[PDB]
Homo-oligomer: A and B are copies of this chain.
């Protein structure tokens, strides 16, 4: 059934992409082709002579703290409506899971067209974006800062912005590992980069932004300390004559709004991305917790191999082959969201999506690290 698409069928694949996501790309068409050859694994199902459905699996890595996890990005999932009754996407999604397990992808992330559809197959919401809007009046400067701000574009890409990013990302779970090639091909789009440097010319924070029709849209705001935060804010304030509206995309852990003269500004939390644990035993081999014991009875209706019972005790992870009626029963969706830090054991317990004794939940709540998830990227 499921075949790995070769170079010939790529135009056909993109014709389905163009149809499902209602856009028309002609010269930029060869970029897509290339991106696919160079960094995607494109999977399809044929009906007769025609490509009926596709899925892309992009090899990635993510940060869960300092630890890098091989992560399989699911993207461009699509089917022509006439073949929807066949349910080809299900077959493809199952196949990608098997491929991932086989290649050593412990974890998967995707951007849902609908959440309920991927929820069905084990993916779960795992990260938000905070979008906040301010106006001209909000642009009050903080105390003068000693360092300097400098501006760059795709062409002037400074290698040092990559370190800044890494330092930031390691504070979270689910941030994408950005190589130079990623930065240039995916991050800049139509944006302008600005880096704040401290008193002795050390890079300390960065932002990605654009200005059009009197609106500054700030896509990434990354300060490593308050000085950097202050330095960058002041830089923004220096645009006050040009801008009527400011829009910023940040993490929930970003405390900038609090410092404003009038902190009651428009601020929306949008669930953004979904994640999934692919190979549990292999995932927990890498995952560091916080240190009576914890037994997890994990269920997974789409990936057979995650139907396991796990023992988290004494700085160790072990698989209980023939378990007993004791410990926490949970879903792969629940496990995935919990281990990303998106929902807490207690929360999903209140919601009745995981089960256990009062004591047992308290123990679980205690081992999962408190680190919050975030992803600044798109695919």
Which A residues are closer than 8 A to B by beta carbons? 19-20, 22, 80-82, 84-85, 113-116, 125, 144, 148-151, 194, 211-214, 225-226, 235, 238-239, 241-242, 255, 257-259, 261-264, 266-272, 343, 347, 350-352
What number of copies of this chain does the assembly contain?
A: 3
Instruction: Give every chain B residue within 8 A of A211 (Cβ-Cβ).
Output: 19, 22
CB distance from A131 to the nearest CB of B (A): 10
A93 → B minimal CB distance (Å): 16
Q: Which residue of B lies closest to A21 (CB)?
A: B242
Option from B84, B212, B241 in Cβ contact (under 8 Å) with A113: B241
Q: How far is the CA of A149 from the CA of B238 in the complex (A)?
A: 51
B261 close to A82 (CB less than 8 A): no
**In angstroms, how far is the closest chain B Cβ from the Cβ of A11?**
14
Least Cβ–Cβ distance between A332 and chain B, in angstroms: 16
A226–B349 Cα gap in the complex (Å)?
9
Does more than half of chain A's interface fall in helix, strand or loop, or is it mixed? mixed
Q: Which residues of B contact A144 (CB under 8 A)?
A: 85
Known: A263-B125, A343-B258. A269 touches B269 (CB 8 A): yes
Give the chain B neighbours of A125 by CB distance below 8 A: 258, 263
CA A17 to CA B61, docked complex, whole Å: 41
> Which chain B residue lies CB-closest to A239?
B81
- Interface contacts beyond A115-B264, A116-B261, A125-B263: sample of 9 additional A-B pairs, CB < 8 Å, sorted by A: A19-B211, A82-B148, A82-B150, A113-B241, A226-B352, A255-B350, A258-B343, A266-B268, A267-B270
Residue among A150, A214, A226, A255 with max Cβ neighbours from chain B (10 Å): A255
CB distance from A224 to the nearest CB of B (A): 10
Q: Among the listed B19, B255, B262, B267, which residue makes an inter-chain contact with A347, where contact means beta carbons less than 8 Å apart? A: B255
Given contacts A22-B212, A116-B262, A266-B268, contact A84 B238 (CB under 8 A): yes
Residues of B within 8 A of A266 (CB): 268
Contacts of A272 in B (CB 8 A): 264
With a cutoff of 8 Å between Cβ atoms, the chain B residues found around residue A116 in the complex are: 261-262
B343→A242 contact, CB < 8 A: no
- For the complex, what is the distance from the CA of A82 to the CA of B151, rounded to whole Å? 9
Q: How far is the CB of A77 from chain B (nearest CB, A)?
A: 11
Q: Is the CB of B115 within 8 A of A262?
A: yes
Partner of A81 from the list B214, B235, B264, B351 (CB cut-off 8 Å) is: B235
**What distance in Å separates the Cβ of A128 from its nearest Cβ neighbour in chain B?**
9
Residue of A22, A116, A214, A270 with highest tally of chain B CB at under 10 A: A22
**What is the CB-to-nearest-CB distance from A343 to chain B, in angstroms, rounded to a whole number?**
7
Bound complex: CA A242 to CA B22 (Å): 8
A212–B271 CA distance with the chains assembled, in angstroms: 26
Given the known interface contacts A225-B350, A238-B82, A343-B258, the answer about A264 and B271 at a Cβ–Cβ threshold of 8 Å is yes
Complex Cα distance A93/B28, Å? 45
Q: Which of chain B's residues has its CB closest to A262's CB?
A: B115
CA distance A235 to B83 in the complex (A): 10
6 contacts between A and B (CB under 8 A): A20-B242, A81-B239, A116-B261, A125-B258, A263-B271, A267-B268
Does the CB pair B22–A214 fall under 8 Å?
yes
Once the chains are docked, how many angstroms separate the CA of A19 from the CA of B255? 29
- The one of B149, B259, B350 in contact with A82, judged by C-beta atoms closer than 8 angstroms, is B149
Q: Using Cβ atoms and an 8 Å threshold, which residues of chain B touch A343?
A: 255, 258
Structural contact, A115 and B263, CB atoms closer than 8 A: yes
A250 to chain B, nearest CB (A): 12
| Of B114, B149, B259, the contact of A262 (CB 8 Å cutoff) | B114
